[PDB]
Amino acid sequence: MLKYIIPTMMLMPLTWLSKNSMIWINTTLHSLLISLTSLLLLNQFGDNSLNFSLTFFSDSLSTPLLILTMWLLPLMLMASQHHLSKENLARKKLFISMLILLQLFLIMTFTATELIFFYIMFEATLVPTLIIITRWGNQTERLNAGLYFLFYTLAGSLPLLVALIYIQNTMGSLNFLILQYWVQPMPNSWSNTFMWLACMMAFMVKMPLYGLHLWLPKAHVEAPIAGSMVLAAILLKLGGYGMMRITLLLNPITDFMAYPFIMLSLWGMIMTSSICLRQTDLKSLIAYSSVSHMALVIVAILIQTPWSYMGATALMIAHGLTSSMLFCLANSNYERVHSRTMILARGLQTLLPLMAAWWLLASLTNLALPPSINLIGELFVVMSTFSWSNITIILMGLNMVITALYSLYMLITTQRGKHTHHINNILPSFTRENALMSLHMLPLLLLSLNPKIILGPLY
Amino acid sequence: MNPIILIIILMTVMLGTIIVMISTHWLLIWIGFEMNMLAIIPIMMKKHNPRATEASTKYFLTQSTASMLLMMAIIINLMFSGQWTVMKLFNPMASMLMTMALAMKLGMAPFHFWVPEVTQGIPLSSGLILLTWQKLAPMSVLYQILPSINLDLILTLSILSITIGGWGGLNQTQLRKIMAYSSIAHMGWMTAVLLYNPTMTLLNLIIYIIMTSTMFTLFMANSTTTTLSLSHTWNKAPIMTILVLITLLSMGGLPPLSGFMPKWMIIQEMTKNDSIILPTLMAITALLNLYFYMRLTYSTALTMFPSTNNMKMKWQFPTTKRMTLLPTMTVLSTMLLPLTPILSILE
Amino acid sequence: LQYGPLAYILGEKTTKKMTENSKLITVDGNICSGKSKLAKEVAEKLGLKHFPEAGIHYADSTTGDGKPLPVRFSGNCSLEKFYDDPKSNDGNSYRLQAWLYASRLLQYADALEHLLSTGQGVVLERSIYSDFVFLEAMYRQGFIRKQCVDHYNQVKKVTVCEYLPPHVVIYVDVPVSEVQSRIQKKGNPHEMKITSAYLQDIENVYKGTFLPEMSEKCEVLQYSAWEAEDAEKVVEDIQYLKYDKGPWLDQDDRKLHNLRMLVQDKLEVLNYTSIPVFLPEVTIGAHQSDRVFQEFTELPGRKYRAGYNEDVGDKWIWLK
Amino acid sequence: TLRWQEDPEPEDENLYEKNPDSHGYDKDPAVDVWNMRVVFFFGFSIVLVLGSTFVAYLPDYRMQEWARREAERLVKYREAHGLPLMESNCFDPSKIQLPED
């Protein structure tokens, strides 16, 4: 995995030695080149994973997440270069440096064979995002958002460190290839109950679980656009990857210790979708939609069936792309009208028709229009939960109805109706914004032709 | 103060610490302790204002009480063993008296009441000398007598120190009091891991010494003693704001910075001995230290507090302070985690 | 550094270079008291270095090329606007007074450094000990508020306490009527806006607050307008004084070494001028301060340290 | 009284005013058009097209086609000899020692 790490750290002298006007061009060009290079990880086998070294490996679960990260970095570079136009040059290079460092930590996180190295990278990802949010955010409460985000993550994750060290001392190794063959049943006791809680609560907070989600409509809102993109698209999936890796050691105690969180996440998505129905803020609405979709992924991982796992990884990738595009569209509206209120700027289809088409496509993929990979993941999770129990179909159908309701409410409020009279600074769409929208849309539509490369390690 | 007299007094402080470290006789340990304290008293009273004399008086009274308790423990050990070799003690009463004397000298809770007032009343350089160098000798004496230490007493002192240090540092606005409460919490950690593996204690002591030296050196480089005067630094030297940001993030134990390594290895050691509740409690309590560190970073580096007019007059002049070893300890306190297996040199 | 503890250990004693002519002389008076040419003629009689009166752009003269900077980089205040509109809404009066007090403190540090390092006497004009007179006059005229006076008193209390007073203070008595006649004869279009009440308040706080408190810690010579023109009488009076008052007598080598260590670090000199006391007059916003600092950095010869500016013609940077 | 000294909020800059041919990338027209060319070439012409071509011709991803061919071979071999196509036990019961009860 050194053939992707080394160009990523070589992006740092590229952005620190460029001219005053050529930092964006150089960084975008070379990050796109490394993103093209990242396709060599698709050498996957039906029986064995692609094991590079003692420290690094990449199976079919971590590969889509890696490709998503390395593709997402140039999108954030293209998105974040308009609101940093008047910034000091050193601060611009520091912003690009934090993005590069976050991408380095993310590509070292998904390939970590050892679990404690995964933990170290997974909590090293906290610092660049906290700095980005609390420094380049626009509002007063970005500091409070950073405090909430940091302390929720650390309070969830310190028992995970203690439990991982206990597993290392008891089993003798934290290597994931060893633990596949050396695993033992975990019996029913109070000690193992708190083992399960300690190993699970970090990823339940990071995903987030309903009731632990209070940091999300703050960190997703007071962040800049690049921060919101990397928080919605990748950082929520660290919890999913962690639960997929760590559930191997927690059997057969999961089958009854997963009941309260299954009830929290089945009822939680109804609550968050209903919250989405009555939101005055566009960014908060997108954040709560993210909470609902990650609740779906939580249920899929917790019922631990093959169809649920395939649906979970497909839904993770699809929701990352869709949430990134929605945050980009909301940011374009914010740059036009300088307010995040959904009722302020209305009827933009008469002024911005192609942006309205992009809005329609993003909304259609949000409500899982087949045959998008959104619908593939949601459908597979629905099938597996129906196999779990039958009233889950009632809950899933209600969730789908409310999801379509709030997605079309978003679209109809922002784009349709009579335009606002007193707003007259609605500039035509730039080529940069349209290129960003198309670079979010075209991979999402192309992946429906070959959806087998995003279906996890048990396709 | 004369430069030569200052030199002689500083070498007397180091000579007292060396005499404590190298000697095999309890009377020589006592002699080194009094030599160190007697020599360090004029460093506290360099400026000659009533606050310095008050701090010196409180420090003298606390150290004299601890020294008398130490002599009592030594005499009891001589009475019940007939020898003076610095090794395990032959009486539980002597062990308890010596452990509380060393706790009073280190300033661990509930004997912690002198540390923030003394640190506040003295200059930044003397406070750095105190909180860094004064703690090398009691930890060495504790390192020599661990077969006689009561486990319940030292663990109670450790958890009390950590909780009281975090809760105390939550409320402060002066930088020296924040540093004092941070010191109290870190000595709680160090004596928590003492009885299981003292090499982890040495590693934590070294890392805390480097981080405290970096933070104090930045403080005297910018001549800031309060929160707001530190918040003025963004309009004078932003590189110092970046340095205090990364050092305060590393002081909170956030990975992948070098401050994560001591508590990581301490938790690794404590779980080998089937102690799981205490490392979790200590981590959850260290979140408070992280909280007031993050509040300092908010006020200093991640926001731009309003400045005044005379900052332009300060712009027109460069700094000339001898910021000794500041880049070295700035690097060594942040990017030392990939060299974690270097701790085997301390065994 | 050029001077430090190592030099003082190696025999650099300041009392060796301190002769009997090494005195600090401060000349005071009203606005057009004619103390300037008296200070010049005193300085060229005993052979002392003359420091002209510090203005807004004194620190610009000390650093860089010595040319005056634009007003938005130094001062952010106008004397002419103070004369035209003393009761302005933007608080120009106290901002100018605070900047001038900081400039006078810097000049006093420079004078003390030259005196202690070369052993030569220094003639000053209106040092920091005679700066609060203008503040008190501005307060008595209602130009500034009470909070400005409190801020000035705090800054003065934490700054002037570690410096030594002048050896001789010379005061020139010119009445307010003659001062007004001189300022209309001068021809400055803004100096004719000065009211008689301001000059009367300046004279009152010179006579009733400054001289009684400075005659105890130093020696005060006071002259009228016509007898101030005879500089030979003044230099005779200075040469025939009996120096037995003030803290200059009980100064050994250690105290003056500490003072010289203080006055050669200009950032340590001006440490307490920018204390975090938020007054509407002197508090600058974050965006304005950032914009002005980024503009100031881009000035020629100001981006880096003094010896490390390539664009102004410095070489051997890679070996420095 | 009057508050602290602070610049007012600057007016928003219209990028289409000074440059009607702006792509929104940079204020200098040359840097802006070169950024557009870089993004459009290395994003669509290089990454998307050749990436889709690479994914389309992946050499038997996760052995699915090989599994189908081997299943055809095994079904033919077992059907020819009258063998059952699949047994209820994955491992031989002869080489398994059940616990005695």
Partner: peptide, 19 residues
């Protein structure tokens, strides 16, 4: 429209004897 930076009240809250 621009970034929010702390006012006099923010620093005045942060600058007491005790928090």
């Amino acid at each position: 429209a621009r970034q929010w930076q702390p006012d006099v009240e923010w620093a005045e809250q942060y600058g007491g004897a005790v928090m």
